[PDB]
Every structure is written in structure tokens, then in C-alpha cells.
Design a protein around this ligand. Structure first.
Ligand code: 8KE
Ligand code: CL
Length: 278
């Protein structure tokens, strides 16, 4: 009952940014603008958009530069502002197309870092924020060696590999891990210096900037997340300015709560939270 329409816009640097619009066959109650994480793409969110559409929400979801169907050197970025600028363009598209709708910004992992960074820069451009295991404390995740390498090299050689990732940690469903590994649109390499630098840009300023986030905020995190420790989300909710902030911890879930076996429970919680607050 929710149909997908694929479009594109010209991002920073004239990069082709592909995005999906998911429209339910019911009067739209709000728009969701969704940012995926490192190395994935927006078509890993079909079921999320479909569940949101069943609640009457319209979802806009882009493939970030260097990801999925969009253009750009794969996983290449030099500054967090490249990602947030294209996210801002997508928010503006949704705004001009549904000007009577509240706007929800939703991000997972690196995309949660993008959404947080957007949210502190444009805190009056959206109404509600939802974050899935947001990468807002990346500095606590690498050795100082990787952090120095990324900071010094991320503008000059943004494609240089600086860290391996355990792709088996994305989900405890082997079918999800298998589908990731066999997806031709997904990045199967290492974390490069440029994305490293961008994540550090978010993580190093999060405590100082999070007071500017005053919109209602929902954070979702699996307690068994081995990629982004849940301790970082616990710290995030202590630093934001919002009085209406919640961390929903899911015991035993891995990183991708929206893809875990319990995903329909997770998405029920998101829909309940959103419906209370629109
Ligand atoms: C400074 O440079 C670095 C610093 C820290 C690290 N450490 C990390 C990073 C991640 N990330 C996972 C994502 C992501 O968006 N994902 C993956 C799962 C889904 O596909 C979305 C982004 N970062 N996971 C675990 N350890 C690496 C380099
Ligand atoms: Cl690589």
C-alpha cells in the first residue's frame, strides 16, 4: 500500500544523488527523511518505509554520495558537511512537496551521526528526530593511531583505508549478514580516512553541540551492539537539550535494530512514539 518512486538531485560537487520517495495510499500525516549508514544504501530500508507508510508517513531516503545508486567515488567524503548538505537538500525537497506536514529526521549509525549533525545545525528545520545506534562517539571506538591518521589524512587522501569492520556484527540473523555480503551495492572494504574524519568531526563536538538539539528525540540501541557500543547513546541522551528524550534499549539485539529478528517490535515502538508526538 506504499509505493516507491525513484528520483535524483544534484548534490554538492554536482554528484548525482538518487533518492526514494515512499508514499502511502492514505492522507499523509508527516514526512520522514531517512539517512542510511556507512557502506549501505536506502534500499536496505524498504520494510522500514513500508511500516512507516502503514502509519500514514511519507518517507524520503537518499543514497549518500559514494553509496548505492548515487554517484561519487565509493565511500569518499572529506567533511561531514558534504553529507549534511545533501541531507539538507532532501529535507528541502520534502518540505516543498508536503509543506503542511511535520518533518521527522531519522538516521542509522553513520546516518545517525549525519542526522545529529544536521539537527544541531538546523534545529528549527524539523519537528522530531529518531536515531538508530547513532555514530556520535566515534573517537571512543578507534585507537588514537587511527584517529590521528584519519584527522591528518582525511582531506588529502580520503580514500585511504584506516580500519577494518566486523560485518558479522551488523545483525544476529545470518540471513541479514548474508544479504549484506552478497549485495553488489554495498561497500565490502575498510573504513576510509575521509569518513573517519567526518565521524570524528561529529563525535568530538557532540557534548558541546547537543544542547542545541531541543526537538523530541528517540534513540534506539541494541544492548549487544558490537559495532557502536550502547554507552555512546546513553551519553548522547544525557547531553541533548530536549526535555522529551528517550533511549529505548533492546536487550540482546545487535547493531541494525531495524533488521534484527525483533524488527517489527522495534518499528512498533517507533510508530507509537511518532504517533504520540505529531
Ligand atoms: C576515525 O575512523 C574510524 C573510527 C571508528 C571506527 N569504528 C567503527 C565504525 C563503525 N561504523 C559503522 C558504520 C555504519 O554506518 N554502518 C555499519 C553497519 C551499517 O552498515 C551502517 C559507521 N561506522 N562500526 C564499528 N566501528 C572506524 C573508523
Ligand atoms: Cl578497502
Amino acid at each position: 500500500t506504499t509505493t516507491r518512486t525513484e528520483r535524483n538531485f544534484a548534490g554538492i560537487g554536482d554528484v548525482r544523488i538518487v533518492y526514494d520517495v515512499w508514499t502511502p495510499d492514505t492522507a499523509p500525516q508527516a514526512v520522514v527523511v531517512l539517512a542510511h549508514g556507512l557502506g549501505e544504501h536506502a534500499r536496505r530500508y524498504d520494510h522500514v518505509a513500508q511500516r512507516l507508510g502503514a502509519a500514514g508517513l511519507v518517507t524520503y531516503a537518499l543514497d549518500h554520495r559514494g553509496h548505492g545508486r548515487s554517484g561519487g567515488a565509493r565511500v569518499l567524503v572529506r567533511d561531514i558537511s558534504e553529507y549534511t548538505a545533501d541531507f539538507d537538500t532532501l529535507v528541502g525537497i520534502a518540505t516543498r512537496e508536503y509543506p503542511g506536514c511535520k518533518r521527522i529526521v531519522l538516521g542509522h549509525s553513520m546516518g545517525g551521526g549525519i542526522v545529529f549533525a544536521y539537527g544541531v545545525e538546523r534545529p528549527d528545520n524539523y519537528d522530531l528526530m529518531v536515531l538508530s545506534a547513532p555514530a556520535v562517539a566515534a573517537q571512543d571506538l578507534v585507537s588514537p593511531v587511527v584517529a590521528v591518521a584519519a584527522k591528518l589524512l582525511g582531506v588529502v587522501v580520503p580514500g585511504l583505508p584506516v580500519q577494518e569492520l566486523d560485518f558479522t556484527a551488523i545483525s544476529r540473523d545470518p540471513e541479514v549478514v548474508q544479504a549484506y555480503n552478497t549485495d553488489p551495492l554495498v561497500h565490502h572494504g575498510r573504513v576510509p580516512a575521509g569518513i573517519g574524519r567526518a565521524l570524528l568531526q561529529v563525535g568530538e563536538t557532540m557534548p558541546r553541540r547537543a544542547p542545541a538539539l531541543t526537538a523530541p528525540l528517540l534513540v534506539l540501541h541494541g544492548t549487544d551492539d558490537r559495532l557502536i557500543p550502547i554507552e555512546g547513546s546513553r551519553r548522547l541522551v544525557e547531553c541533548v537539550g530536549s526535555a522529551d528524550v528517550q533511549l529505548k534499549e533492546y536487550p540482546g539485539l545487535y547493531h541494525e535494530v531495524f533488521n534484527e529478528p525483533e524488527r517489527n517490535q522495534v518499528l512498533d515502538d517507533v510508530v507509537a512514539w511518532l504517533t504520540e508526538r505529531l
